Amino acid sequence: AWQAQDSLRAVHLLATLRQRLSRRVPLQAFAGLSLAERRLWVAQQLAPEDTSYNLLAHLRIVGATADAIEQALRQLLERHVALRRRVETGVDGPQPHALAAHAVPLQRLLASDAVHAERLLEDGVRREGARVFDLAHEAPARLLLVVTRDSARADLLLSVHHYAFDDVSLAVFAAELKTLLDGGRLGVLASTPEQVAARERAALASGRLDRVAERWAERLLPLAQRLALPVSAAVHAACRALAERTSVSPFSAALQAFAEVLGAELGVDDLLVGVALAGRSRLEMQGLVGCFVNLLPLAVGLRPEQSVEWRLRQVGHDLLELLEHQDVPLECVTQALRQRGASGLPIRIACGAHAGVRVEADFIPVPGARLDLTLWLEDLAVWTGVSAIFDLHRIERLHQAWERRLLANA
Secondary structure, three states, X not given: OOOOOOHHHHHHHHHHHHHHHOOOOXXXXXXXXXXXXHHHHHHHHOOOOOOOOEEEEEEEEEOOOHHHHHHHHHHHHHHOHXXXXXXXXXXXXXXXXXXXXXXXXXXEEEEOOHHHHHHXXXXXXXXXXXXXXXXXXXXXXXXXXXXXXXOOEEEEEEEEEHHHOOHXXXXXXXXXXXXXXXXXXXXXXXXXXXXXXXXXXXXXHOOHHHHHHHHHHHHHHHHOOEEEEOOOHHHHHHHHHHHHHHOOOHHHHHHXXXXXXXXXXXOOXXXXXXXXXXXXXXXHHOOOOOOOOEEEEEEEEOOOOOOHHXXXXXXXXXXXXXXXXXXXOHHXXXXXXXXXXXXXXXXXXXXXXXXXXXXXXXXXXXXXXXXXXXXXXXXXXXXXXXXXXXXXXXXXXXXXXHHHHHHHHO
């Protein structure tokens, strides 16, 4: 398990050991629709013409025929029900209904050369970016397959609504596509998006997740344009060294400097920071396709009187607590806060981190921002902010302050 594998890899290590030898180990001492699907679906209902929930994935495939690619995609659509479901509104919750795999639109186009293949792709990007999905009557996914004449390269544009997809789903979809195009076989899936929702309803009914949310509501109660810049090697090394001395993850050190820079910028002593989590809490959710992402709050205290090491231990500790209980939906934390006299929790800032046929898959970023400012680290610092608050030049200034804060803390 060790040789097969960050702190998310630590969760995967503890899950493999739990499946083989039983008994937990709690990470902190070593390091119908689900609510994840529903919160994206209801946000689309409140703004039906908003297309900021359209996910566009570009898959570059080298070494497979058009017939083999199309056939492999029909297999993946049959295998992953989340890409071929319609959603009826319900009296006590939206209700999904499975559709046939052939009902997913698939358009094959032949391009004369590579430049023509780019232009077909760009035209598809603009068309799918402005498209309003009919989530009640059609599948939430479309596919554009562009093959280039006299070339081994084929391009696949996957447009799928966010309620039925996420980042890990793209990696699973791309790897399984490569497996089929190579001639391999896919094992029987151990779960479905519907089973995840059913298990969540049981966990909600047992009060287990709400008790964890009530514990978090204590600390959280007082608080109740895209730019991609490369991180210098000196800042990356200092981030790693600071984490090794503090026994936290390198992401915890980068989150701490992120919250401290923004806290000084906004002039506050405490800053609420969201942490985007993959939300696949059990081993059989690792190979699923759908939406499992869960944004959970993290209260960072900006105490200049305290040491850098102590502030970092608190950040990394609170981070592993959110990682352990990433199955606790954000709505549970909101419910616990309202039960203590709060209108809600106001999250404005967030953070996160990401032989044979060749399959390269990447998302085309979604324009517009729900949150005021986000920082995503790619193993590259991707800053996304609302233009009216965090413009391009203000983001560049914050990234420089973030890099300085990291070097100073180390």
